Design a binder for this molecule. Structure first.
Ligand SMILES: [Ca+2]
Length: 1148
């Protein structure tokens, strides 16, 4: 080649990766053919060779790993200390040149740095000298007073955004005037926590025209930095006089703190890492990429919780303190819960909180009467039931608290009739929760059947590649066996569904976002943090397009949706839940656009009302065609002769999921009952190439389609009728047949019994309960009515109009969205301003009240008025048993978002389970968390308001006396929660304020605090109170002392100097420096932790060190000696360090 020389064997082979001669030991690289420089150990140990070939004499030579050898003339390597070009270098006994290595060599203490270059460990490495922080101006800039008055503060603490009142204002930069009350200025104008930040602040403000055209750094002198700040101050004050405002300064101070910068490498780094998320590192396993747990500390007395509160992870499975599987042989008993989900996690193991949760439930259940007392119909605008949200992320005690309430208020334990008038539901995703619910929790709330959901998806909704057999519907792991469901009051009461506002929607969108912009959002979990409205609009045009496509070309969305809904709505022993987004489009105006499936599904829904009743049986023939039969009311098997009600009731369903179904000579059979022999049947739903046909009466059917049962009550189908299809709505075949001659009076539903029941379950899976149906009446991605939206865009108005629609569909429980005024801060999907769905809120009692000026100010769904009217219209609708349509409140006890006020709290960095991510610098440190509510919100009005009232009631005695499982204590209604505070929270997601956002003197190592004059906090910087103040290192006949920028002395702390070396200062206020009498290896603080301190005082880090005896130790990033441990080196070298701390010796 050219500029490359390569060699091949006396053979086909290239000879990559080994040494070979020609006429000179040329190494050739294992990947590149190319001849490289290398060091060969063959023959005499340690020979060295260059690219051209031939031995290296008297020169440096570098290894494939990166090891640097030095040879003498004659080719032998050198070891020990060597002077190469008037520079000392250390070579170990392996001949490697080494960096970050300290030791006494030939009676000289040397430290070889990152270079490899020796420094004298005798010579001081810091600037000798102090620098006064007293100026002509310090008298004027000193604080007006040293207490809460004169500082903006978080519980007494100061942050980087603290503003203060100085004694004088340099007014229009020309005249020192006494300061008025409103003359506050940002602390960062006159004080900084070290020189580096000071330097950066100066460059930044100068970049806004308020500064010097000169670049500064931490390397720059202290006195220059101070003088330059004064020039900036003149500029600031003139601008303030010009603008008649300081808001501009607040803006530019805030943006400085989060400013980014170039680096040496050339990338964007944070200018102030300790004031941003960058410094908040730990585990990523939390939806928002980090979490804190709040933990008590003496420094922060009012953020501290009581003893034995903050019990994390009391999921139904672990309510006791330990996992308990309630599941039996076929079923799973896993728990996938975890305490810290999103936002600020409410502590529901605190009994005062638990009472506040009860209060809230009472409020919702009486929302109408409470909010509109003057209105004589207030009593008709009350909620009826609740949906418990995020059950696996809150203390399970709450399930019992609620169960107790509804027994107390509505006597739901008495009979089916009362129970079924208030139908609650759990968001209980863990498998174990089904059985916990049954054994521990009565069935006070309805479990979800997840086995049904997952099977409907696997067997029908998947593409053909991934799709399960229909035979799976007759499997054993299913919660409710329906192969021969011929009884009542056996099945575990449950609600079953296919999609929901979150499940099987938001993840399909996030996948699309990710498959278009992997650059920005590489995973689906990450994509849920997407906040740009552009990204959703884009994704949705795709999603909507995909839904219109044929089944074989559905790249993103669910196949066979009407086939699935047909099984779900005809199934026995379940309360079905319909998702809004399967009738209507998940995006756009509320109820404005229908899906491809609206016809099919709304047919089924009314049909259910007329025919679906009696016993059930599932089958799947050799061809894998599912045939589900309902025998009609009064008949529980195929061999049952039934009641008078049987003849004209009882549906039958046929489903295949094979698009190339060819029956050939085979036959499909719907075995209706012997109660249905010699009987004419007609289709409700059928599949063409064009789509699905829906016949809505007998008279819409053509006579040839009619078909009559034989003497056994069977229907038989040919290949002429049933083949494979591939439409938008069906891969495989779908058919629904109903008996001919039904009347308009005919209703298949059953009235609830008023008899007392045996056992502990509130609900019982029987005919009456199966007469119920839930409609999830919202979507995440419903468009958000713009500021000046017309009154009829708001979903709660549209609900009221269409009230009868839902009654016609058989709806008995209308599950509304959460109605709580949403955050718009984009911290998570639910809080982005384009989908303020109502799961992200600050004020749990605010369901859309008018503003203070009395202007209508609604939620996404409408005003409080509009909500009250939605509930009245639904209540005004009456179902088959004469009772109203129930309205369901989404009960969201897990968290709060986006709280207005900061509080000081003690934090530990953790993951979502609460497990300490063990970052050293985040161990019970002080954080300014947005964790306190306004105290003027509706929480402050209604919080705990009804608890005194409720205690006095006899009916609630059980509730209040009940011993809760996890707390082992009873609920505590005696304290009211009107302001949320940190003490009522388990923890929070990481808020990116930065570790060092709360300000602190580094010499004393105490926090500043202006609300206290206790000795656990440091007094204000000495200059900010017009006292003498100096900073720097000062050498003395005794030793070395150090004063911080604030003027205090270093005692019992480590101290980093000029982004370089670390040092330690003892109890006497003196630097620690090893002497000849007392060597370098030293405990310093009664911690069992050993450091390596040079005679400079330099405490070495990421570096090896030596005894005078000859042993080697390694000291980690924190400077601590390493024990019982392997250490990998830069050049891929390995060293083992014994429990001893000493290195294990090598020699080869
Ligand atoms: Ca929680």
């Amino acid at each position: 080649d050219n500029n490359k020389t390569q060699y091949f064997g006396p053979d086909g082979a290239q000879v990559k990766g080994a040494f070979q001669q020609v006429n000179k030991n040329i190494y050739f690289d294992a990947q590149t053919g190319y001849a490289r420089q290398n060091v060969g150990f063959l023959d005499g140990t340690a020979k060295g060779f260059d690219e051209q070939g031939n031995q290296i004499k008297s020169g440096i030579a570098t290894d494939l790993s990166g090891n640097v050898y030095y040879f003498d003339a004659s080719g032998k390597m050198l070891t020990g200390v060597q002077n190469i070009d008037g520079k000392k270098y250390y070579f170990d006994e392996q001949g490697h040149r080494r960096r970050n290595y300290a030791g006494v060599f030939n009676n000289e203490f040397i430290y070889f740095g990152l270079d490899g270059v020796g420094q004298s460990a005798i010579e001081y490495q810091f600037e000798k000298g102090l620098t006064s922080q007293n100026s002509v101006a310090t008298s004027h800039n000193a604080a007006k007073s040293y207490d809460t008055k004169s500082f903006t503060n978080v519980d007494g603490f100061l942050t980087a955004n603290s503003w203060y009142r100085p004694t004088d204002i340099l007014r229009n930069g020309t005249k020192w005037e006494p300061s008025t009350e409103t003359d506050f200025r940002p602390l960062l104008m006159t004080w900084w926590p070290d020189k580096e930040v000071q330097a950066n602040y100066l460059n930044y403000m100068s970049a806004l025209g308020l500064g010097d055209q000169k670049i500064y750094t931490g390397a720059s002198s202290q006195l220059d930095l101070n003088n330059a700040a004064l020039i900036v101050q003149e500029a600031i004050e003139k601008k303030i006089s010009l603008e008649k405002s300081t808001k501009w300064l607040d803006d530019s101070i805030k943006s400085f703190i989060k400013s980014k910068r170039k680096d040496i490498q050339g990338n964007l780094v944070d200018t102030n890492p300790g004031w941003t998320i960058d410094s908040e590192t730990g585990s990523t396993n939390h939806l928002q990429n980090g979490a804190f747990i709040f933990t008590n500390s003496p420094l922060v007395p009012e953020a501290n919780a009581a003893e034995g509160n903050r019990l994390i992870n009391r999921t139904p499975s672990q309510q006791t303190g330990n996992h308990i599987s309630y599941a039996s042989q076929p079923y799973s008993g896993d728990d996938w819960g975890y305490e810290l989900l999103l936002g600020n996690d409410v502590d529901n193991s605190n009994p005062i909180v638990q009472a506040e949760q009860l209060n809230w439930i009472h409020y919702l259940m009486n929302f109408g009467t409470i909010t509109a007392p003057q209105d004589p119909d207030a009593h008709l605008a009350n909620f009826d039931s609740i949906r418990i949200d995020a059950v696996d992320n809150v203390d399970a005690d709450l399930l019992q608290i609620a169960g107790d309430y509804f027994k107390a208020a509505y006597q739901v334990g008495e009979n089916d009739k009362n129970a079924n008038q208030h139908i609650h539901i759990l968001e209980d995703w863990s498998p174990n929760d089904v059985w916990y619910n049954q054994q521990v929790n009565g069935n006070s709330q309805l479990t979800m059947d997840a086995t049904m959901q997952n099977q409907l998806l696997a067997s029908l909704t998947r593409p053909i590649t991934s799709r399960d057999s229909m035979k799976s519907f007759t499997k054993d792991a299913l919660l409710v066996h329906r192969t021969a469901d011929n009884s009542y009051n056996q099945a575990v009461p449950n609600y079953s569904f296919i999609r929901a506002h979150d499940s099987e929607v938001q993840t399909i969108i996030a996948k699309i976002i990710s498959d278009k912009h992997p650059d920005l959002y590489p995973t689906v979990d990450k994509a849920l943090l997407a906040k740009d409205s552009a990204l959703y609009d884009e994704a949705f045009t795709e999603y909507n397009a995909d839904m219109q496509k044929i089944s074989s070309q559905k790249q993103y969305t669910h196949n066979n949706m009407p086939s699935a809904y047909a099984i779900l709505l005809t199934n026995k022993d379940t309360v079905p839940r319909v998702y809004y987004g399967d009738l209507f489009t998940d995006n756009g105006e509320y109820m404005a656009n229908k899906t491809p499936y609206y016809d099919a599904i709304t047919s089924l829904l009314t049909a259910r009302t007329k025919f679906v009743s009696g016993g059930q049986s599932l089958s799947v023939d050799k061809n894998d065609v599912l045939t589900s039969v309902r025998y009609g009311k009064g008949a529980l098997s195929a061999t049952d002769n039934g009641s008078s009600d049987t003849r004209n009731q009882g549906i039958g369903v046929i489903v295949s999921n094979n698009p190339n179904l060819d029956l050939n000579n085979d036959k499909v059979t719907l075995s209706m009952g012997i109660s249905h022999a010699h009987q004419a049947y007609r289709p409700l739903l059928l599949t063409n190439s064009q789509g699905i046909v829906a016949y809505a009466t007998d008279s819409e059917v053509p006579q040839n389609l009619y078909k009559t049962t034989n003497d056994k009550g069977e229907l038989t189908f040919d290949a002429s009728e049933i083949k494979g299809y591939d439409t938008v709505q069906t891969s495989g075949y779908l058919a629904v047949w109903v008996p001919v001659g039904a009347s308009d009076e005919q209703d298949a539903r059953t009235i609830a019994s008023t008899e007392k029941n045996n056992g502990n379950s509130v609900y019982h899976s029987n005919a009456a309960l199966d007469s119920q149906l839930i409609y999830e009446g919202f979507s995440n991605f419903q468009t958000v009515p713009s500021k000046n939206a017309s009154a009829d865009e708001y979903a709660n108005v549209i609900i009221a109009k269409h009230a009868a629609d839902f009654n016609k569909w058989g709806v008995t429980s209308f599950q509304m969205a959460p109605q709580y005024r949403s955050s718009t801060d984009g911290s998570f999907l639910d809080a982005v301003d384009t989908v303020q769905n109502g799961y992200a809120f600050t004020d749990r009692y605010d369901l859309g009240f008018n503003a203070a000026d009395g202007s209508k100010n609604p939620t996404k769904y409408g005003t409080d008025e509009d909500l009250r009217n939605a509930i009245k219209s639904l209540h005004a609708q009456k179902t088959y048993d004469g009772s109203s349509i129930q309205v369901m409140a989404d009960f969201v006890p897990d968290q709060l978002y986006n709280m207005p006020l900061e509080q000081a709290v003690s934090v530990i960095r953790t993951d979502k389970y609460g497990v300490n991510s063990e970052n050293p610098d985040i161990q019970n440190i002080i954080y300014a968390a947005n964790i306190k509510s306004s105290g003027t919100d509706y929480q402050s009005i209604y919080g705990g308001k009804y608890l005194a009232e409720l205690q006095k009631n006899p009916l609630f005695k059980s509730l209040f006396d009940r011993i809760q499982i996890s707390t082992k204590k009873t609920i505590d209604p005696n304290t009211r929660i009107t302001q949320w505070s940190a003490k009522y929270f388990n923890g929070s997601n990481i808020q990116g304020k930065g570790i060092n956002y709360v300000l602190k003197d580094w010499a004393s190592n105490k926090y500043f605090n202006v609300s206290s004059n206790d000795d656990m906090y440091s007094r204000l910087p000495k200059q900010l109170m017009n006292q003498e103040s100096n900073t720097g290192f000062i050498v003395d006949d005794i030793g070395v002392k150090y004063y911080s920028i604030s003027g205090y002395q270093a005692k019992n702390t480590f101290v980093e100097d000029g982004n370089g070396e670390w040092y330690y200062f003892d109890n006497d206020g003196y630097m620690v420096k090893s002497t000849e009498e007392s060597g370098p290896l030293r405990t310093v603080n009664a911690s069992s932790k050993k450091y390596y301190i040079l005679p400079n005082g330099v405490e070495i880090r990421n570096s090896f060190g030596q005894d005078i005896q000859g042993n080697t130790y390694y000291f980690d990033a924190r400077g601590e000696m390493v024990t019982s441990q392997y250490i990998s080196d830069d050049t891929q070298n390995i060293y083992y360090f014994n429990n001893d701390g000493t290195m294990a010796k090598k020699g080869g």
